[PDB]
Design a protein around this ligand. Structure first.
Ligand SMILES: [Zn+2]
Length: 257
């Protein structure tokens, strides 16, 4: 099945998931000079004060920090979005080296990693139904670069030892995702897809301009995770990113000048 290896990586995904070559695939390169300021975009509303994290899971391609999305507790609205989108999970993509790891790029620049906070449109009732709709999901993407430590990430880093291998999960309550946001909410937005199979074209992408900084020790612990299950040969979980896909008939809008 699909992964990020030489024989099952992004260049092979189209064989099982033909939409891999579709008209609104993600991620993409963000050409900053071509993105147009759109004054009709509203400010983004990130309301995570009542967020309820539950669990952290190594699913064999990343780790997801999962939230209780059975009520409006952590929601995204405004910006390009109509209606209310509930936080279901966040995860990261990252590299084997600091010079790569992000899925989106900015004028071809790759960051060390990229955070995805995944939200689904409540008008569709559940996540399974939402992914079947062109406006079913809103993903907030945040770049990571390596420098000073991010304090609000440390809690995540320190639980990774307990979910080293595929299929392992651990209780992860009372985590506050506000600790992962940069200072500025300036963003680019465009219509796109999930960046993992099934690659459904159901996402409004909201990519923040300002990266967060994490420490070399922080990213080094992320790179100790495994793609494999326990008792299987160790393959380090690194370079779990899909490269940039053709923009085709899409415009990237900026929230800022
Ligand atoms: Zn992702």
């Amino acid at each position: 099945h699909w992964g990020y290896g030489k024989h099952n990586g992004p260049e092979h995904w189209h064989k099982d998931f033909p939409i891999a070559k579709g008209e609104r695939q993600s991620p993409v390169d963000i050409d900053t000079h071509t993105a147009k300021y759109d004054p009709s975009l509203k400010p983004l509303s990130v309301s995570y004060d009542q967020a309820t994290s539950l669990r952290i899971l190594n699913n064999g391609h990343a780790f997801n920090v999962e939230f209780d999305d059975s009520q409006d507790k952590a929601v995204l609205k405004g910006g390009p979005l109509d209606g209310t989108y509930r936080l279901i999970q966040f995860h990261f993509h990252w590299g084997s080296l600091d010079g790569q790891g992000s899925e989106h790029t900015v004028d071809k620049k790759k960051y060390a990693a990229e955070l995805h906070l995944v939200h689904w449109n409540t008008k569709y009732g559940d996540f399974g139904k939402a992914v079947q709709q062109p406006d079913g999901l809103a993903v907030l993407g945040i770049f990571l670069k390596v420098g000073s430590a991010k304090p609000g990430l440390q809690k995540v880093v320190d639980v990774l030892d307990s979910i080293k291998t595929k299929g392992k999960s651990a209780d992860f309550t009372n985590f506050d995702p506000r600790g992962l946001l940069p200072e500025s909410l300036d963003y680019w937005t465009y219509p796109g897809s999930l960046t993992t199979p099934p690659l459904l074209e159901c996402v409004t992408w909201i990519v923040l301009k300002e990266p967060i900084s994490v420490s070399s020790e922080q990213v080094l612990k992320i790179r100790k995770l495994n793609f494999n299950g326990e008792g299987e040969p160790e393959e380090l979980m690194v370079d779990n990113w899909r490269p940039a896909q053709p923009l085709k008939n899409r415009q990237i809008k900026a929230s800022f000048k």
